[PDB]
Amino acid sequence: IVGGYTCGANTVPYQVSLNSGYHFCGGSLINSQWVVSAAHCYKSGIQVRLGEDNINVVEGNEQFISASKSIVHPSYNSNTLNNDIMLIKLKSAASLNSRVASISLPTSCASAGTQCLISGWGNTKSSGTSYPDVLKCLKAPILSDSSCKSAYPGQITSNMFCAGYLEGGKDSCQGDSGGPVVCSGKLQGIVSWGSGCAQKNKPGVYTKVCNYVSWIKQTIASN
């Protein structure tokens, strides 16, 4: 997260860290057994870390649970990043409490102009590399599809939306991938891609979760 602020310990209780010996992507807890992340975050041997604030210090609210399976959307295209969504099943159920909680899936898509909360442990520098200890947060509005396509001509599919600030300075970044964009209490986006981070006229591009709710619910029910 570039240009954000310290969320506060366990204030984003659906935020998880995906760990393969080190933090490499975010995710969002959607029930006690399932995490939503980005397809481009797929790796074997993922350990899901819940209840994290400082990812480098054991603070006493962590749950470390191996992924038992991952289901990458079958239509994911790793060139265009269309359908950049994956579901991770936990080997055992997370224990839900005030610090580890699921986020609701949308019942409708969000509208341009709505403020959303984007969070993660990704890079905080637009011109360099710097990874934080504690979870970082950014408030950012959904941008119009027209301004999104104007920034990224030919590159935006119906399964993507832009959010952030055309002026630059405030954005998600590498290592935030797969984590949440929550708008009006609902998981509306997944950190997916962008041209650089926090650059002028290149807002963040996010997987449009509202297009996938039926797929998510049927997949987690059957698997």
- Binding residues for Ca(2+), as ranges, are 52, 54, 57, 62
Shortest distance in whole angstroms from residue 23 CB to Ca ion:
10
Candidate list 17, 37, 53, 84, residue with the active-site label = 84
Report the residue number whose CB is nearest to ligand 5N7: 194
By three-state DSSP, how is residue 148 classified?
A: helix
**58: exposed, middle or buried (Cβ count in 10 Å: 0-12, 13-18, 19+):** exposed
Distance CA 29, CA 46 (A): 15
Per DSSP, what are the bridge partners of residue 138? 118
The reply on whether position 177 binds ligand 5N7 by CB under 6 A is yes
Q: One symbol per residue from 188 to 217: x for binding ligand 5N7 (CB under 6 A), - otherwise; what is it? A: ---x-xxxxx------x-------------
To the nearest 10°, the Cα dihedral for 54, 60, 66, 69? Answer: -80
Q: Which is nearer to ligand 5N7, 69 or 125 (CB)?
A: 125
108 in Cβ contact with 210 (< 8 Å): yes
- One DSSP character per residue, 38-100 reads -GGG--SS-EEEES-SSTTS--S--EEEEEEEEEE-TT--TTT-TT--EEEEESSPPPPSSSS
Picked from ligand 5N7, Ca ion, none, the partner binding residue 204 (CB below 5 to 8 A depending on kind) is: ligand 5N7
* Catalytic-residue membership of 40: yes
Q: One symbol per residue from 20 to 59: x for binding Ca ion (CB under 5 A), - otherwise; what is it? A: --------------------------------x-x----x
Candidate list 17, 28, 102, 177, residue with the active-site label = 177
* Catalytic-residue membership of 177: yes
Distance CA 3, CA 105 (A): 27
Nearest to 170 by CA among 137, 147, 146: 137
The reply on whether position 119 binds ligand 5N7 by CB under 6 A is no
Q: Which residues contribute to the annotated binding site for substrate?
A: 171-172, 174-175, 177
The reply on whether position 78 binds ligand 5N7 by CB under 6 A is yes
Shortest distance in whole angstroms from residue 32 CB to ligand 5N7:
27
The reply on whether position 53 binds ligand 5N7 by CB under 6 A is no
**Side chain identity, residue 25:** C
Residues near Ca ion (CB under 5 A): 52, 54, 59
Report, as residue numbers or ranges, the catalytic residues. 40, 84, 177
Residues near ligand 5N7 (CB under 6 A): 40, 78-79, 81, 171-174, 176-177, 191, 193-197, 204
